[PDB]
Structures are given as structure tokens and as C-alpha cells.
Design a protein around this ligand. Structure first.
Ligand code: VX8
Length: 1134
């Protein structure tokens, strides 16, 4: 079934079976169903059970459950089977320069060249398949662990689950979703790196005769210093972290109230604030970047000293042959690479991996839910001596009841009086330590908060069972659902989405009652499912199935109805956490008559980026001119010396490629600084261009999809991309310079190197298309896992009460396998690309070596000493190219935002008002006309409730609107919008208060006098409500102005409107928002001190706006008018 079960060994080895998708992924787009099936052994269901067997074996064998030592018997052995291969692959790398250091002798060298080419072939065979298998073991680990974690998630008691932090689960799972899988190509370097040195410091001793340690000590100094830079980096990034949240909260707030900023004309204030916050964040990030450059440059200036200090003493004491320079250097590369990068990566990998395993081990131990011994045999359900604590706080006062197998009881009380907790106990999700609460235990549930799964109506109303036509017909016609079935689009199999928004409250309640009464259980706990259906609909359902079809059997509802509780064979009414009274229906309805009566990626992007900043041109030109002149200088000195000991000890500089062309401290820093300044410029201009997009465009961009263009891309553009571009330039420069040096020594390397560089570039272009497409596919394949996780958590109570855990286990396993296919395929194709790269390098080396040998002393030494160890930096250059082309996507999406357009007396007149949300949608008005009168209101009533938001907002020119407005002699044409939208003054239903001090949250432009502000505050009815604040007035209104209440915030907004001398006050929702005392305050303020602003009070109920003088009546698509109540409540309203 898979593509791997049919393949030759050679094809499984050189990754030939991945050819057809590459044969496909080049020419055309991939269709999601083109992804080959998973190999059988990687099926989640075939691994989770295996891992669980060993896990609970570790649990039941000892009382120190080291999960890692339950893994050590699952995968460990194949782990060794790949570790030994990797060890051999690295010993080959270490020992090859010895077979290099014999052919400098010159006959007897060609044979060693053949052997060395075979050494390259051995390395390129033993590395890549072993690394791929290791990554495969990593993927198996991740899948098995996720399956166990999920399967466990549906076993937690509720006492601990409602106490876990909602973000803990998502962070825990997603943390090791990509990292941990690749965190096994670097595990064996905990005992590879040591064996390499205890090998190397043998051979080098055999060469130096006294001086081994003198270089290892330098490497220890260097590595310790470089790691010490780690904390001096992390401290800066820590200090920046919370500061990023401080910058981000105001951006989120602004994004979430954009139409307020547009109406108040505050664009410049927000821009200035965002700048003044970002300044110091850039300060810290720039410091961090300089430190990180020092870090990455220490590794590049190692390669010279690591050999100069190891060569200096023995050279001093005795003259050294030249063979012991070109040879030792080729060891010095490996040793450096095996104590500075390979070791700390292994150490960090084990830290992080064992930390994550510690976390998961500490997870699986948590308190485990148990399903009670039910459905064995039982008569009438009995709940005797029931005492339960909502956290010793008694939600139940030792209650008891016997409910007959067929009878009917009804609970009632205050909302959440613990009767819900009493059911969640009788439902077995809360454990009361008192008494005996038990039943037959075959119970169905219908919770107050319905959940909607993914699938058709038959699915959410079956939950994994057959469909009986009589049962479905009775339910639908009974649950007010035969209409709800038929009325739908396809009417029987609507392919539903998630969230439940596709239906209303009534449809959702019908669906929940259906899922409840679907199958027959010895009890039906319907926790007030009749609370979202209409009263007549409630009576319909009660007469239909609630009190008709499931009443002939046992049932225990929880309802607060005055009519329903009458007909139940028992009643239990509770207050103050205890039953006020209860008993039989007649006895309860009589035992308290008073109480009973009371209760009821293009080169456009590259060039654009590189030329956003006229200093980047200069930095690149300088960096390249210095590189070119340095190549020329080293080449001329090489020729001069090629055609006192310092003469021949010069060779140690050119003889190492790295330090020749490594970015000096006077050239590598300004590039890193310039990139960060480019990030600032781009961020500022994106902000400027998202504060002026026309509002009929922003509407398309859903609100969650703009903040992520700030908190994600700009973070990348600050931290990641500058370093990656720096490393790419450094590595490409090194490679090209070394290849130039190799070329000039004899001019046959050039004409062979051209059809090798062409091959590299062609292969890279042939691969990246498929790699990027498969990356994207994996990206959208990751989402349904978390969707299913959310759906599982939300409906856990009902899920467990049904008893349908395995079905969802299988569904989650399906989603897992569906992601696993894409991941496995991407991994395999990446490794194929690496193999082809290294093989092409190997043929290039065959060419260089044989051409050089078959045609001096320093010539051969330098040629070979570069063409041997350039491969590592070449592979880094290729991987860095991949990473930079990946990271440029953020720049591309940023430029997407960069390209949006800018938006554009008291008496007045209005005509021809065309308005809609989109360009040409539903006409908000049809040539609406009116007169705006002097010094008196114009009430907006009539069809108030058909939407006054359209005309109200379009009066501020903040919708897809155009037409005719003429205010006091001026029109909507001449004056600038930023000076026209300020004449009108909004009084929004949701007042905006920036997270800052009062002087800035009320007068953000800061053009007022503090005494003027004090006067405008006191006279506007806020002095009292502002006297109770910290300090005097500088209170930082943190967390969205939580302290103030609707009345105080409304008065503040009113003062902010009174500030700029607004000549129109379109106040909306007077009584809905204001409290009663606050309503009196607002009325007495606006009528008295806002006396002569031509307000338009637009409230739905006519009783709120009947007071105003005129009435510009409201009516859909035609704004009729009755100038006075002499016809208003007689013609428009009647
Ligand atoms: C005693 C022993 C035997 C074998 C192993 N190897 C493993 O099990 C495997 C593994 C697991 C997680 C990893 C990892 C490698 O590499 C990583 F990616 F970094 O994370 C299957 C290879 N490990 C140990 C061991 C080590 C350290 C501590 C303990 C302990 O009992 O505390 C036990």
C-alpha cells in the first residue's frame, strides 16, 4: 500500500522512491491527495498501544516510573543501530587527512587519491541514511507520545481538570511538535565528540611530538567563552520579552477599535506612541544582535588560532617540514568542529529533551477518573445521604431521594445552586464522600451548554449509532426539528462547521435534546435543555418527547418552570445551598402555601527590500570591495611567494579558508545594524499604511489576521532574518573566494567548476518548489489536530457520560496519521536533496584532485587543503539559502500590507446618500435626504432596530458610502476628511480609553492646558468620579480602563467630545449603557451644558427619543419623516 513496501535496496538507500512526486512537484501543483500512504509500522494505532504496554509495565513493575526507561526498550536498539553507523561516518572524516598527508610527498600518490575518493563515498553512504532513520525514530517517538497524551486527556477527574490552565495543554503539546522530531540527529554526539578528540589528540601527538594540549586548551577557552555569551544574550532577550507585551497591548487595542481612531482623527497620536515604545525595544534588540555577532564570529576566527597556537611552540624549538602544516590544518578543522558546535548542540538537545520528558512524565501521573460500577443491576435510583463540596462548602445538605424506574422528578432552585453539581455527582463526574448515590448507571446527559461536533445533523444527533426511521421521525417531529431538518439547506445531511455559529440557540437546543433522547438509558439528566427554546416551543417539546415519550420511562430533569414542575411526580426546590422543601408532588405543593404561591518570493521582493534603505547599498558595496581587494592581495602574495621562517609560516593564514575571508569587526557589524534599521522602517511604514486603509477593505481582513502581521512578522524581521542574511553572505563569500583561489592556481578547475555550480543551482531550483509546497501542505494539515482536541475538551462531560471514548480516540488517530504522512514525506525528500548535493560535490572533488595531481609543493598543498574541507561550509551555505528563502515570506506578506490605498454653522442638508459595507452591497439608503436644523435635536426613531448604524456611521464617512452632504455651506468634497470627520462628534456605545495616563487617554494630542483640562473635567460631571483615583489624575488606565463604569466612561467620552468644540453630537443608546443614576447624570449633562449641539439620539424604543423636537423617522431603504408627533406616532409608527 505504501511506496516503501515495494522498493529495491538501492532505491531505499539513495532515496529513489521519492522521485515521482519530485517528477510531479516540479511541473504542476500538488493535490493534497497525492501524498503517499504512511508505511504500516508508523500507523499511530500500531505505536500508541506498544508504548502504552511498556509504560504501564514500568508502572506495575516498580514505584519509580522512569518513562525514559520504558522507552529504552522500545526504540533504543534501532537507535544504536544508527549510532554506530554515524560513528563510522565521523571517524572517516577524522582519519581522511592522514591519507591526505602522504601525497604531498611528490607514482605512489594516485592510489591514495582513489582511496580518498572512496573515503568520500563511504562518508556519503554511511551518513545520510543513518540520519534519516534517526529522524524516523524521532517521528515515531513524537507520534506515540502524542497519542498517549491524548488518550490520557479523557481520563482526568473534573476536580483537577477545571483547575488546569487552558493554555497549558496547547503549549505543552505544541512545544515539542517540530523540535523534538529533529532532536535525534544530534543525540549521539554526546559520545561521538569525545571519541573524536581522544582519537584526534592521538594522531596530532604522533605529528607534533610534544604539543597536543596547547590547542585543546584554546578550544576549551573558546567554547566556554562562547557559551558564557549565552546568558549575556538571554538576559537581554528576557528584558525585552515583557517589554514586547507592553508594546503589543496598545497595538491590539488600536486594531480592535480602528473606527474610533478614524472618527477621532488620532492616527498621528497612535503612530507617535508606537514609535516612542519601539525605540528602546530596538535599543535592546540591537545590543543582543551585536552580542550574537560576536558569538558567531568567534567560531569563524577560531580556525586560524586553533592551529597557530598549536604550531608556534614546536616550530620555535625545531624546524618543521611543510607536510606538517597542510596536514595538521586539516585536523584542526575537524577538532574545532567537534568541540565548538557539535558538543554544545548535543548538550542542549539532551537538556531540552529530558525537560520535555520530565514534563510529560509529571503529567501522566495526575489524578485519574474512574467510571463507576454501573449497568450491573439496580432498581429505582437511590441517592441517600448526599453531601458534596464544590471545592467543605456544602452544595447539598445531605440530600436523599428514591426515583422509580419509570417515575419522574424535577429539581429546581437558583441558577447553579449545586443541583447542577448534584447531577454531575449522580452523573459520576463529581465524587461525594458521603452516603450512597447510585442507580442502574445507564444514563444519558443533556447539558445546559450544548456542544456541536463536526459532522451532519445525523452525526451530531447519532454520536456513533445507526439511524432508525421511526426514531428519527419521532425525534425530529417531536424536538421542533422536522422543521429544523427540512428547513435546512440540504435538509438532511448539512456538512457542518465548528463553533456552532451556523445555528441559533433554538436549533442548538433541538440538536442537544436530540443527542440526549437518541438512545434509551435508565436515566435522562436534561439539565434545563428547555432554556433556549421558546415557551410555546418548550410546551411543544414537552408534549412531544420530553413529557411524552421519555416520560413513560424514568427521567430526572432540572428545570425552573412554573408549569412543568407542576406535573412531575417529585419536586425538589433549593435555596441557600439546601432544599427549602421537597417530597411528593401533592405534598410539596401544599406543605407551604405561602411559599408555594411566592416561588411560582520574487526578485521584486529582493530588490525592494535591499533598496528600502540607501545605506544598505553602501554597506554591501563596502563589504564586497574589501572582499575583492583581499582576495586579490592574498592571490598576489601567493604568486609572489610561489614564484625567515615567517615566510613559510605565512601559509597558515591562506591555508585555512575561514579566517581569510571571515567578517571583520569593522565590516560585519554595520550590516547587522543596518538590517535592524530596515526592520524599524518597514514596521513604521506598515503601521502608517494600516491606519489609512479604506474601511471597506480592512473589513475583509478578519481581525485576528492583522495583529499576526505585527506580533509575528516584525518579530522575525527583528531577530531572525538579519542574522540569517549575515550568515548567508558570510558563507557564500567564503565559498566563492576559496573557489577563486583554487581556480587561479591552475586554470582547469574553472571550466570544471562551472558545470558543477550550474548543477548545484539547478538542483536547488528543482527541489525548492516541491519542498515549499509540502511545507505548506503540512502547515494546513497541523490544524485539525488542535480542532479535534478543542472539540474533545469542550464536550468531555457529555462524551464520557455517553461512553464513546474509543470512537474519538480513533478519529484523533486518523488526524495524526494524516499529518504523519505529510511530515514523513517532507523529511525523506529533504534528505534526498542533501544526498544529491553531497554526491555532486564528490564528483567535483574527483575532478579537482585528479586534475591537480596529474599536472610544485605549495600549489598542491593549498589546492587540496581547500578542496577537502570546503564541503562543510558549502553544505551550510546551501542550508542557509534554504532558510533565508523560507524567512523571506514574512517580508513578502509585509509588503502585501504596504500596498493598500489611503481612504481619501450647524445647519445642513443631505441628499443621495448611497451607502453599503462592500462596494455595491445592500443599499443602506436610497437617495436619503433630510435637513439638519439649527440648535434642536432630530430624534431617530421609527424602524429603529432595522439598523441605524449604517446611516449613523456613514454620516462620518466611515463606510462604503458616497453621495451628497452640504454642511453650513461646505460639502464633502473640498475640506479634507481629517478636518471634516472632526466636525461631527460621536458618542459611541463602547467608549475607548487608551491604556495610559488620563492626560493622555483624554487629550492624546496633548495640545491643552492642564487648568483647561481640569475645568472641562469638573464642569462636565467627572470631578467627583475623578477625586477617588491614585495620585491626583495621572492614574495609568491599565487593562482597558477596567476601573471605570459605563457611566463614568461615557462621561469621559462626552468630555473628550466637548474638548475640540464639536458642532454635532450623534449620541447612540442613551439608556441601554447608562445606569439609572448615570442616566440622570448623562441627561442633565447633555440637555444643560451640551444644550446647543444638534444631537441625534438614536435609541430603538420610541420612549427614549420621543422627547426630542423633530423626528427624522427610520424606515428600511426609505427614510420617511414626520416633523412632529402630530403624525409621528400616527403615521410612521402607526
Ligand atoms: C538508560 C538509557 C538508555 C537509553 C537511552 N536512550 C533512549 O532511551 C532513546 C532516547 C530518548 C529520548 C531522547 C533521546 C534518546 O535523545 C534525545 F532526543 F535527546 O532525547 C531511545 C534512544 N537513554 C537512557 C537514559 C539517559 C539519560 C537519563 C536516563 C534516566 O533514567 O534518567 C536514561
Amino acid at each position: 500500500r505504501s511506496p516503501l513496501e515495494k522498493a529495491s535496496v538501492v532505491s531505499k538507500l539513495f532515496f529513489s522512491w521519492t522521485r515521482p512526486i519530485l517528477r510531479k512537484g516540479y511541473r504542476q501543483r500538488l493535490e493534497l491527495s497525492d501524498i503517499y500512504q504512511i508505511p504500516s509500522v508508523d500507523s499511530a494505532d500500531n505505536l500508541s498501544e506498544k508504548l502504552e504496554r511498556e509504560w504501564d509495565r514500568e508502572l506495575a513493575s516498580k514505584k519509580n516510573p522512569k518513562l525514559i526507561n520504558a522507552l529504552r526498550r522500545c526504540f533504543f536498539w534501532r537507535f544504536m543501530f544508527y549510532g554506530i553507523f554515524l560513528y563510522l561516518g565521523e571517524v572517516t572524516k577524522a582519519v581522511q587527512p592522514l591519507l591526505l598527508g602522504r601525497i604531498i610527498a611528490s607514482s605512489i600518490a594516485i592510489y591514495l587519491g582513489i582511496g580518498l575518493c572512496l573515503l568520500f563515498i563511504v562518508r556519503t553512504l554511511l551518513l545520510h541514511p543513518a540520519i534519516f532513520g534517526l529522524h524516523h525514530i524521532g517521528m515515531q517517538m513524537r507520534i506515540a507520545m502524542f497519542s498517549l497524551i491524548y488518550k490520557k486527556t479523557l481520563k482526568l477527574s473534573s476536580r483537577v481538570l477545571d483547575k488546569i490552565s487552558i493554555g497549558q495543554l496547547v503549549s505543552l503539546l505544541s512545544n515539542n511538535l517540530n523540535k523534538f522530531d529533529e532532536g535525534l540527529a544530534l543525540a549521539h554526539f554526546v559520545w561521538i565528540a569525545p571519541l573524536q578528540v581522544a582519537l584526534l589528540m592521538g594522531l596530532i601527538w604522533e605529528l607534533l611530538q610534544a604539543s597536543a594540549f596547547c590547542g585543546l586548551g584554546f578550544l576549551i577557552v573558546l567554547a566556554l567563552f562562547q557559551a558564557g555569551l549565552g546568558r549575556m544574550m538571554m538576559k537581554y532577550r528576557d528584558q525585552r520579552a515583557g517589554k514586547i507585551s507592553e508594546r503589543l497591548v496598545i497595538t491590539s487595542e488600536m486594531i480592535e477599535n480602528i473606527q474610533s481612531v478614524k472618527a477621532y482623527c488620532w492616527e498621528e497620536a497612535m503612530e507617535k506612541m508606537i514609535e516612542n515604545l519601539r525605540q528602546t525595544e530596538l535599543k535592546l534588540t540591537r545590543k543582543a544582535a551585536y552580542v550574537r555577532y560576536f558569538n558567531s564570529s568567534a567560531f569563524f576566527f577560531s580556525g586560524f588560532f586553533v592551529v597557530f597556537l598549536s604550531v608556534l611552540p614546536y616550530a620555535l624549538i625545531k624546524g618543521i617540514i611543510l607536510r606538517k602544516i597542510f596536514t595538521t590544518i586539516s585536523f584542526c578543522i575537524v577538532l574545532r568542529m567537534a568541540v565548538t558546535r557539535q558538543f554544545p548542540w548535543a548538550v542542549q538537545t539532551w537538556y531540552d529533551s529530558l525537560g520535555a520528558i520530565n514534563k510529560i512524565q509529571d503529567f501522566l501521573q495526575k489524578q485519574e477518573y474512574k467510571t463507576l460500577e454501573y449497568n450491573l443491576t439496580t432498581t429505582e435510583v437511590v441517592m441517600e445521604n448526599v453531601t458534596a463540596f464544590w471545592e467543605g462548602t456544602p452544595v447539598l445538605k445531605d440530600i436523599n431521594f428514591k426515583i422509580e424506574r419509570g417515575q419522574l422528578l424535577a429539581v429546581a432552585g437558583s441558577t447553579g445552586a449545586g443541583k447542577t453539581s448534584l447531577l454531575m455527582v449522580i452523573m459520576g463526574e463529581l465524587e461525594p464522600s458521603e452516603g450512597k448515590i447510585k442507580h442502574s448507571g445507564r444514563i444519558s446527559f443533556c447539558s445546559q451548554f450544548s456542544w456541536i461536533m463536526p459532522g451532519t445533523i445525523k452525526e451530531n444527533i447519532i454520536f456513533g449509532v445507526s439511524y432508525d426511521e421511526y426514531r428519527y421521525r419521532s425525534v425530529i417531529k417531536a424536538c421542533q426539528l422536522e422543521e429544523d431538518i427540512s428547513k435546512f439547506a440540504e435538509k438532511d445531511n448539512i456538512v457542518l462547521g465548528e463553533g456552532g455559529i451556523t445555528l441559533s440557540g433554538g436549533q442548538r437546543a433541538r440538536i442537544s435534546l436530540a443527542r440526549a433522547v437518541y438512545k434509551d438509558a435508565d436515566l435522562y439528566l436534561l439539565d434545563s435543555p428547555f432554556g433556549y427554546l421558546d415557551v410555546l416551543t418548550e410546551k411543544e417539546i414537552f408534549e412531544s418527547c420530553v413529557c411524552k415519550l421519555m416520560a413513560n420511562k424514568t427521567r430526572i430533569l432540572v428545570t425552573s418552570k412554573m408549569e412543568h414542575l407542576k406535573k412531575a411526580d417529585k419536586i425538589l426546590i433549593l435555596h441557600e445551598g439546601s432544599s427549602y422543601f421537597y417530597g411528593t408532588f401533592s405534598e410539596l405543593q401544599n406543605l407551604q402555601p405561602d411559599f408555594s404561591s411566592k416561588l411560582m518570493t520574487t526578485w521584486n521582493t529582493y530588490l525592494r527590500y535591499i533598496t528600502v534603505h540607501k545605506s544598505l547599498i553602501f554597506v554591501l558595496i563596502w563589504c564586497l570591495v574589501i572582499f575583492l581587494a583581499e582576495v586579490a592581495a592574498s592571490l598576489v602574495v601567493l604568486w609572489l611567494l610561489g614564484n625567515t621562517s615567517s615566510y613559510y609560516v605565512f601559509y597558515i593564514y591562506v591555508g585555512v579558508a575561514d579566517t581569510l575571508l571571515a567578517m571583520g569587526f569593522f565590516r560585519g557589524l554595520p550590516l547587522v545594524h543596518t538590517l535592524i534599521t530596515v526592520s524599524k522602517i518597514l514596521h513604521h511604514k506598515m503601521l502608517h499604511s494600516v491606519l489609512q486603509a479604506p474601511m471597506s477593505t480592512l473589513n475583509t481582513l478578519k481581525a485576528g489576521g492583522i495583529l499576526n502581521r505585527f506580533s509575528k512578522d516584525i518579530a522575525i524581521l527583528d531577530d531572525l532574518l538579519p542574522l540569517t542574511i549575515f550568515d548567508f553572505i558570510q558563507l557564500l563569500l567564503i565559498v566563492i573566494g576559496a573557489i577563486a583561489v583554487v581556480a587561479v592556481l591552475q586554470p582547469y578547475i574553472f571550466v570544471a567548476t562551472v558545470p558543477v555550480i550550474v548543477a548545484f543551482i539547478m538542483l536547488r531550483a528543482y527541489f525548492l518548489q516541491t519542498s515549499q509546497q509540502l511545507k505548506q501542505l503540512e502547515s494546513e494539515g497541523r490544524s485539525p489536530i488542535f480542532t479535534h482536541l478543542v472539540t474533545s475538551l469542550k464536550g468531555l462531560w457529555t462524551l464520557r457520560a455517553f461512553g464513546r471514548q474509543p470512537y474519538f480516540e480513533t478519529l484523533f488517530h486518523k488526524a495524526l496519521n494524516l499529518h504523519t504522512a505529510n511530515w514523513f514525506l517532507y523529511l525523506s525528500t529533504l534528505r534526498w536533496f542533501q544526498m544529491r548535493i553531497e554526491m555532486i560535490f564528490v564528483i567535483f572533488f574527483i575532478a579537482v584532485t585528479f586534475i591537480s595531481i596529474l599536472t610544485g609543493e605549495g600549489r598542491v598543498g593549498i589546492i587540496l587543503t581547500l578542496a577537502m574541507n570546503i564541503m562543510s561550509t558549502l553544505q551550510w551555505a546551501v542550508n542557509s539559502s534554504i532558510d533565508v528563502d523560507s524567512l523571506m515570506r514574512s517580508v513578502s506578506r509585509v509588503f502585501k500590507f504596504i500596498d493598500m490605498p489611503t481612504e481619501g454653522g450647524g445647519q445642513m442638508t443631505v441628499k443621495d446618500l448611497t451607502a453599503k459595507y462592500t462596494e455595491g452591497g445592500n443599499a443602506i439608503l436610497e437617495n436619503i435626504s433630510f435637513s439638519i436644523s439649527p440648535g434642536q435635536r432630530v430624534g431617530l426613531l421609527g424602524r429603529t432596530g432595522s439598523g441605524k448604524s449604517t446611516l449613523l456611521s456613514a454620516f462620518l464617512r466611515l463606510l462604503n458610502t458616497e453621495g451628497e452632504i452640504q454642511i453650513d455651506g461646505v460639502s464633502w468634497d473640498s475640506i479634507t476628511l481629517q478636518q471634516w470627520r472632526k466636525a461631527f462628534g460621536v458618542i459611541p456605545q463602547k467608549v475607548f480609553i487608551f491604556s495610559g495616563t488620563f492626560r493622555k487617554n483624554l487629550d492624546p494630542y496633548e495640545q491643552w492646558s492642564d487648568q483647561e483640562i481640569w475645568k472641562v473635567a469638573d464642569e462636565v460631571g467627572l470631578r467627583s468620579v475623578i477625586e477617588q483615583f491614585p495620585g491626583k489624575l495621572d492614574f495609568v488606565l491599565v487593562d482597558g480602563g477596567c476601573v471605570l463604569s459605563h457611566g463614568h466612561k461615557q462621561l469621559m467620552c462626552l468630555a473628550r467630545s466637548v474638548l475640540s468644540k464639536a458642532k454635532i453630537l450623534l449620541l447612540d443608546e442613551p439608556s441601554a449603557h447608562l445606569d439609572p443614576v448615570t442616566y440622570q447624570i448623562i441627561r442633565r449633562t447633555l440637555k444643560q451644558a451640551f444644550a446647543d449641539c444638534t444631537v441625534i439620539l438614536c435609541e430603538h424604543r420610541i420612549e427614549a427619543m420621543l422627547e426630542c423636537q423633530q423626528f427624522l423617522v427610520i424606515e428600511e431603504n426609505k427614510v420617511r419623516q414626520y416633523d412632529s408627533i402630530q403624525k409621528l406616532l400616527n403615521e410612521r409608527s402607526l
